[PDB]
Amino acid sequence: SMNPPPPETSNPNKPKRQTNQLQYLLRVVLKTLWKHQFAWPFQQPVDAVKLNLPDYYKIIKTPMDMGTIKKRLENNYYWNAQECIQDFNTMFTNCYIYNKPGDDIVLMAEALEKLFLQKINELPTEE
């Protein structure tokens, strides 16, 4: 079968912005997660074809991954921090929805989410 197009990382019709919170999300949160031992399966869109997961995009209709988030941050795609936090949450929830609770990928996601929550706990006040 085929993969869907990936989520957009830029859009001329979407207002763009940089805030200190978004700067923190790229510099501190994304960077910390990106270098984690278990980050790699989350660093790009799920390739359902090459991973032989024909039902993935039948079940997951709002895909998200850290590669997309990284690019969105780099492109000033977001208007605010909440949009970016929502993308992280979508990434984690998708993983928990599609996979079985005791699967390795779920434990990998759980480790990353714990670290994510630790880092966004110190999200600075907006300036």
Ligand X SMILES: Cc1noc(C)c1-c1ccc2c(Nc3ccccc3C(C)(C)C)c(C(=O)O)cnc2c1
Write out the residues near ligand X by the rule CB under 6 A.
41-42, 46, 51, 53, 95, 98-99, 104-105
What span, in angstroms and rounded, lies between the C-alpha atoms of 86 and 64?
10
For ligand X, give the closer residue by CB, 53 or 111. Answer: 53
Sign for the CA dihedral angle at 17, 21, 27, 29 comes to: negative
For ligand X, give the closer residue by CB, 3 or 99. Answer: 99
What span, in angstroms and rounded, lies between the C-alpha atoms of 53 and 42?
16
Q: Least distance to ligand X from the beta carbon of 88, Å?
A: 13
For ligand X, give the closer residue by CB, 19 or 67. Answer: 67
Q: Least distance to ligand X from the beta carbon of 98, Å?
A: 5
Task: State the burial class of residue 122 (Cβ atoms within 10 Å of its Cβ: 0-12, 13-18, 19+).
Answer: exposed
Q: Least distance to ligand X from the beta carbon of 53, Å?
A: 6
Structure-token pair, residue 1: 């079968």
